[PDB]
A paper describes a structure:
From PsBphP1 preparations dissolved in a HEPES-NaOH (pH 7.5) buffer containing 175 mM KSCN, we generated cryo-EM maps of Pr and Pfr using either dark-adapted samples containing solely Pr or samples irradiated to steady state levels of Pfr (~80% of total Phy pool) with red light immediately before freezing. The combined averages then generated an EM density map of the PSM at 2.9-Å resolution which was further improved to 2.8-Å resolution through symmetry expansion and local refinement of 1,666,098 matching protomers. The resulting data allowed construction of a head-to-head dimeric model encompassing residues 12-459 and 466-516 of protomer A and residues 11-459 and 466-516 of protomer B. While this 3D map provided high resolution for the PSMs, the HK bidomains and much of the S-helices were poorly visible probably due to high mobility. BV was covalently linked via a thioether linkage to Cys16 within the NTE. As expected from other homodimeric Pr models, BV in both protomers assumed a ZZZssa configuration, and was fixed within the GAF domain pocket by an extensive network of conserved amino acid contacts to all four pyrrole rings and the B- and C-ring propionates. Besides the covalent connection, the PAS and GAF domains were tightly linked non-covalently via hydrophobic interactions within the figure-of-eight knot created by a lasso loop extending from the GAF domain to tether the N-terminal extension (NTE) projecting from the PAS domain, which was further solidified by a noncovalent contact involving Ile27 at the knot center. The GAF and PHY domains in PsBphP1 as Pr were linked covalently via the intervening helical spine and noncovalently through the hairpin extension from the PHY domain contacting the GAF domain near the chromophore.
Here, we present models of both states for a dimeric Phy with [name] (HK) activity from the proteobacterium [name], which were built from high-resolution cryo-EM maps (2.8–3.4-Å) of the photosensory module (PSM) and its following signaling (S) helix together with lower resolution maps for the downstream output region augmented by RoseTTAFold and AlphaFold structural predictions. Pr/Pfr comparisons show that bilin phototransformation alters PSM architecture culminating in a scissoring motion of the paired S-helices linking the PSMs to the HK bidomains that ends in reorientation of the paired catalytic ATPase modules relative to the phosphoacceptor histidines. This action apparently primes autophosphorylation enroute to phosphotransfer to the cognate DNA-binding response regulator AlgB which drives quorum-sensing behavior through transient association with the photoreceptor.
Numbering used by the authors:
A (entry chain A): 12 to 459, 466 to 516
B (entry chain B): 11 to 459, 466 to 516
């Protein structure tokens, strides 16, 4: 029943939001296949008679000719601005193709939207990129990015919601209006954004919901007279959203949303979420500018993540070189010579326990668990086959790890690729962390049709059995130590065979 | 030595500024004038000699001096907004920085043509430009759209993407030229065009503009600051006189205006977005900053797609690497012998036409292989460096005895296991005859007379021999992965042999 949250066909809602008009048409002659029901009020045209008719009937001859010229022999990926005044109401036109048919969306521009101009709100664009490149911290990047986005959009709340591996996400940047609830640092259940929503947003990197009280406007005819199926509004900005999400936004107290998908290597790294207490529409030009800001944000995040990884590598290079020098001139087994100086090995990874296993002898330094427990863990670790392994919560993946979770809640293990059972394990003790959640972690939904949770208060969750995160430099140091041990061990076996 | 004189001039201390602006180096607290450019005798009509030890209120007015004082007070001078002033009826754009405990303020003179140009329309397609940059799937597309946008905003006839090489010389990879204008696409340029001093300066200052090449430098009076009795360091000053040799070089090219943005990748001068105009024309500082931001985005996207290409090569070589690893694991012989069991797969792993496998006084050659003695001499030379892997596209350049077999093996990709036993795998690529294009005389960078830039700018063919096809990033990745697999398998075999 929880999994029902990821079963709705969001790609085929059969309706569009009332803030615009939709026209799915045949490509060559621009004959109308289906039209949204909103044309009974806007432009005053009956949607039933608008079947198998050219765009000239409703949109006028000149605008239809312009659309025909634009869509002819074009990939529809570099279409310029298209603003039309159709019976005195202004529309911004976007073109794409769903299934061998031309889908055209007319976003209705109100007087407030017309007053807003793309020049002044994007005048500080170059200064914003200069600040982005000049920022030396990720927090500075987030702060200036959400500040600029709030400046152009004008929304009360702007969030940077980064997703985790399991699905749930965390807010890391917050820019809120006065007397407005703060979600900085709060974790949210994965049910807020289902797998279907994430999959859709991996392709469409821009979504806007001006109002949460809107009544969806159905598409007539519902079935296309081409394949007798439902129109795929996957890349359509004029797509009705699930009513559960509207109720969720109402429960949060916001009535307008605007999200830009952040993509890093084809994965939904995070979302630039936005929130307004009152309905308000954002022009498509500003939305595209925010999308470009999001792509630049992802690029700079990747750049500084690589910078941090290289900084950790540089600060661990000296320790790695010292350990390599000790290993090369020990004349004993590689891990024995490594264990000759235990404190240096400890500070190489910053762990409080060292366990070195070499063919039925295990040596423990510092805060070390029971040797039998470490042996059982080690024989479990070789089953995966990975040369190195890092785990910040051993009890989560290793059920018998709860007994010694107070002593060893973080395990960083690395072993040489030889039949002899050998390896090096670093243990980090548990740190008691009160993770902050927005609402009930154990009650994501008010089971009644699914209903979003009404309560949005901060809950403390004392998450036990989790140690300090292993940094990228930590696993880099483990891998470099493994490589040095490989080289030195090969040298020793070759020399021993020679002599 | 005399050629090295190209990298000895003190460009950071020219002692003069270009006439298209005004310079004011001042004391920080009271904004008292330390030195002022000599151009104030014509602009604003002030004697530069009497303007010593005087506040900015004397020349710049009370309100503008107060604004500058407020801006420079308790500020890092890295986020200063626009500063436009109308000083005795002529407009200036003000830039602030600090050289040595003193406030350096540059007033770029904005002409009527510059005033007519607005930052809105020329940057209206900014978001579309970034969308095109991110949507481009090829480096050539990136270069094309980048130079197209930069030419659109700047209006210059020629725009070049000049990427530097390791040795200093660079190559143009993007070209956007006006009709009836000479093309430099694909041409190589000698390293003497941009000396080491210029590269070092541009590594810090990522924006340079020279509106005119016939300008007479305007000296700074007093020449020596009455603080340390030294010369003012105009390293980060846009109003800095350039070397006359560079002006003569630009005149020889036929251009009278230049505009370059430094491209930085990991703290290194990857390349320059060079520009060229046949007539003098000034570009406002706002458009120059926008072009600088475009250059930084260009570098970021270049790095992104370079990583993408490296990962694509890794992916397309993963299957071959896995097959070779499977063959290595179940051979029961020596690692390189089992590797040599299938020579064609090893060849197509790196796309080389010669394979040489060395294992303890036996060398096995497959395909186009040199003389075994030559390969042995090369191999004993290779272990001297100590690098686990080595890639060379021109062996004769670094290995003098490699000219004998340059027709057969001009590219060497070698990888060896870290053991006392002399073992290794070498891949040989044959020489490909390439006619490198140079702009002018490669053997005569300068017309030795003071150094004089070369007058001739015609295309010269240079048949560069002894150079094989470049080893790709995927090539060295495959070599390193093969080395790692050989390391793991060899350790397993020695451990098993010791056990039994
Ligand atoms: C089990 C079903 C539920 C549900 C489904 C659902 N939700 C969306 C859309 C979104 N939900 C979002 C979540 C947040 N908005 C915020 O402001 C914050 C944090 C402060 C969170 C975690 C977001 C960002 C979206 C995207 C839309 C937007 O607001 O821009 C969908 C997708 C609907 C569609 O695209 O048509 C679905 C199916 N959400 C729940 O919470 C439960 C009740
Ligand atoms: C041995 C001395 C010489 C000399 C010195 C020199 N040159 C510069 C400045 C530049 N030279 C550049 C070269 C090019 N411009 C182009 O258009 C092309 C290709 C089509 C090339 C290779 C460039 C780009 C610069 C930077 C300035 C600019 O044009 O934007 C300096 C630096 C002077 C200063 O910064 O004050 C110096 C010392 N150049 C020679 O060719 C010889 C004669």
């Amino acid at each position: 029943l929880l999994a029902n949250c990821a079963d709705e066909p969001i790609q085929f809602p059969g309706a569009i939001q009332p803030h615009g008009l939709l026209f799915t048409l045949k490509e060559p002659e621009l004959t109308i296949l289906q039209v949204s029901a909103n044309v009974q009020s806007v432009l005053g045209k009956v949607p039933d008679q608008l079947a198998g008719q050219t765009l000239d009937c409703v949109l006028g001859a000149g605008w239809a000719e312009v659309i025909r010229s634009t869509s002819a022999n074009d990939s529809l990926v570099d279409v310029p601005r298209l603003l039309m005044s159709v019976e005195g109401v202004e529309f911004e036109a976007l073109l794409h193709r769903s299934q061998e048919a031309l889908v055209l969306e007319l976003e209705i521009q109100d007087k407030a939207a017309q007053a807003i101009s793309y020049s002044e709100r994007t005048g500080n664009m170059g200064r914003m990129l200069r600040q982005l490149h000049a920022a030396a911290d990720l927090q500075t990047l987030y702060e200036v990015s959400v500040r600029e986005i709030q400046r152009m959009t004008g929304y009360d709340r702007v969030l940077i919601y980064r997703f985790e591996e399991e699905g749930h996400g965390q807010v890391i940047a917050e820019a809120s209006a006065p007397a407005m609830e703060l979600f900085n640092g709060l974790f949210f259940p994965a049910s807020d954004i289902p797998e279907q929503a994430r999959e859709l947003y991996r392709r469409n990197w821009l979504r806007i919901i001006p109002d949460a009280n809107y009544t969806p406007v159905p598409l007539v005819p519902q079935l296309r007279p081409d394949t007798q199926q439902q129109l795929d509004l996957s890349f359509s900005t004029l797509r009705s959203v699930s009513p559960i999400h509207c109720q969720y936004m109402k429960n949060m107290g916001v009535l307008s949303s605007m999200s830009v998908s952040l993509i890093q290597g084809g994965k939904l790294w995070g979302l630039i979420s936005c929130g307004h207490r009152t309905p308000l529409y954002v022009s498509h030009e500003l939305r595209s500018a925010c999308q470009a800001i999001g792509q630049v944000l992802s690029l700079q995040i990747s750049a500084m993540e690589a910078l941090e990884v290289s900084r950790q590598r540089e600060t661990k290079i000296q320790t790695l070189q010292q350990l390599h020098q000790m290993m090369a001139t020990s004349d004993t087994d590689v891990f024995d010579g490594l264990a000759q100086q235990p404190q240096l090995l400890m500070d190489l990874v910053g762990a409080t326990g060292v366990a070195i296993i070499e063919d039925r002898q295990t040596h423990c330094y510092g805060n070390c668990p029971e040797p039998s427990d470490i042996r059982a863990l080690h024989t479990w670790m070789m089953a995966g086959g990975e040369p190195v392994y890092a785990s910040h919560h051993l009890s989560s993946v290793y059920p018998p790890g709860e007994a010694y979770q107070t002593l060893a809640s973080g395990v960083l293990a690395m072993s040489l690729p030889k039949p002899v059972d050998n390896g090096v394990i670093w243990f980090r003790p548990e740190v008691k962390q009160s993770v902050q959640w927005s609402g009930d972690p154990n009650k994501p939904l008010n089971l009644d049709r699914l209903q979003p949770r009404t309560s949005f208060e901060i809950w403390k969750v004392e998450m036990t059995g989790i140690a300090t995160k292993w940094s990228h430099g930590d696993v880099f140091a483990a891998n470099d130590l493994r490589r040095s041990a490989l080289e030195n061990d090969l040298a020793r076996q070759v020399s021993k065979e020679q002599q």
